[PDB]
């Protein structure tokens, strides 16, 4: 209570003293400034040249209090800008914090986990540096227990959060050898009862799946897709969000990888996802659907069997534009690879009207994506001879009148398909 509101100069004065206690008091004061909720004087702490002195206190084993005070202190300094996080790493904090992971005091080792989390969370460079210092083995060792429930709640949460940061960022992506080293424990954290652990766990996965098919594969081969589909139907939005992102990334890969999420029973959840109150959930859901309709024909059939086509029509009809744009993509991929019988069913569900009303939108790309679909539908109509019957349906919903305007559009690729449609069919 007597270390509240110290001046930065006072903190340096006590730390520069030859008295261990005086240093401890000043260090605790420095922390209380950083933990003051309104704009802490980080830059001033750095320009004072204290960081190096804080890092050296992390080594004082005999005095565990100052270890905690300094770990806490540096943690907040590392939570700032990349320039401020760089200062902590420059002070030689990485190897010091990794040493604290073996500390007998859980509350101290938790700070090391917290700190290293901020450092790796900065970017790929520091992420890889934390890994090169050998921070993974210690971290994973802290979770080497029969049951995770016995571990402290907050302690388990921060550990998970730190691990998710070591799987974060893309350019470059985390070392393959490091990802394999963490996955097994990540799959274990993906079955824990705590929601915050499941959330961060799903985010960790969503990071790994984000990339080439080789990255997606090593995650799929761990057999987590089923667990993700289970989490995909959770009540907590914070949990469903990353789960949907993960599944959304897995379906961007091979059709075999895409088939795994179908076998898991993911499509049975989309009736809720495609009508989910939150707008972004619909956008992510529809985006995932577009990567499924772009697969095989038997895969497109799965979507038809689950009666998800009507939902795509509803989302194409009334939703946030961003979501409606994803809907257009879903239809386009659906009409390009789907059979005639499939495209027919799509039309009888009432896809035309809502697909024509989106031609009024002022987005250059969606128009291309739509017109492309229209061409694909006619492409099937010719195989039935009912190109005339289709033209009429488009004409009765003020569709032709809008294609007439796109026939004279600025973008070159637009008027190409438009004029080609007016001429060939109308």
């Amino acid at each position: 209570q007597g270390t509240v509101n110290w001046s930065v100069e006072d903190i340096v004065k006590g730390i520069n003293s030859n008295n261990l206690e005086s240093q401890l008091q000043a260090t605790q004061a420095a922390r209380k400034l950083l933990s003051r909720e309104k704009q802490p004087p980080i830059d001033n702490i750095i320009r004072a040249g204290l960081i190096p002195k804080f890092v050296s206190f992390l080594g004082k084993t005999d005095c565990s209090p100052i270890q905690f005070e300094s770990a806490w202190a540096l943690t907040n300094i590392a939570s700032g800008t990349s320039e401020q996080t760089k200062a902590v790493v420059d002070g030689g904090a990485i190897p010091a914090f990794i040493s604290l992971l073996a500390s007998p005091h859980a509350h101290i080792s938790e700070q090391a986990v917290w700190a290293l989390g901020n450092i790796a969370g900065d970017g790929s460079a520091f992420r890889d540096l934390v890994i090169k210092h050998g921070a993974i083995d210690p971290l994973l060792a802290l979770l080497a227990v029969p049951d995770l429930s016995t571990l402290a709640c907050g302690y388990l949460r921060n550990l998970t959060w730190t691990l998710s940061n070591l799987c974060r960022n893309k350019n470059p992506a985390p070392p393959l050898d490091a990802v394999e080293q963490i996955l097994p424990t990540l799959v274990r954290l993906l079955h824990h009862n705590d929601p915050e652990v499941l959330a961060d766990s799903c985010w960790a996965i969503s990071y790994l799946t984000d990339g080439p098919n080789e990255r997606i594969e090593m995650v799929v081969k761990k057999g987590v897709v089923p667990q993700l589909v289970k989490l995909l139907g959770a009540t907590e939005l914070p949990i469903v969000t990353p789960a949907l992102r993960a599944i959304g990334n897995i379906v961007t890969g091979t059709d075999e990888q895409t088939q795994k999420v179908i076998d898991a029973g993911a499509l049975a959840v989309f009736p809720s996802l495609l009508t989910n109150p939150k707008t972004n959930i619909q956008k992510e859901a529809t985006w995932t659907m577009s990567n499924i309709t772009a697969g095989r024909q038997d895969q497109i059939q799965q979507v038809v069997n689950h009666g998800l086509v009507p939902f795509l029509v509803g989302v194409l009809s009334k939703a946030d534009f961003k979501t409606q744009k994803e809907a257009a993509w879903a239809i386009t991929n659906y009409t390009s690879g789907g059979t005639v019988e499939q495209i027919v069913y799509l039309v009888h569900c009432g896809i035309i009207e809502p697909l024509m009303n989106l031609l009024s939108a002022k987005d250059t790309k969606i128009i291309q994506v739509i017109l492309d679909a229209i061409s694909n539908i006619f492409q099937a109509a010719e195989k039935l001879g009912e190109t005339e019957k289709l033209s009429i349906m488009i004409e009765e919903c003020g569709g032709l009148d809008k294609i007439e305007a796109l026939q004279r559009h600025e973008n070159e690729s637009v008027y190409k398909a438009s004029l080609n449609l007016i001429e060939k069919y109308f």
Partner: peptide, 12 residues
């Protein structure tokens, strides 16, 4: 793209 990649421990 999810949660903040940096946490400051500033309790009350």
């Amino acid at each position: 793209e999810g949660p903040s990649a940096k946490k400051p421990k500033k309790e009350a």
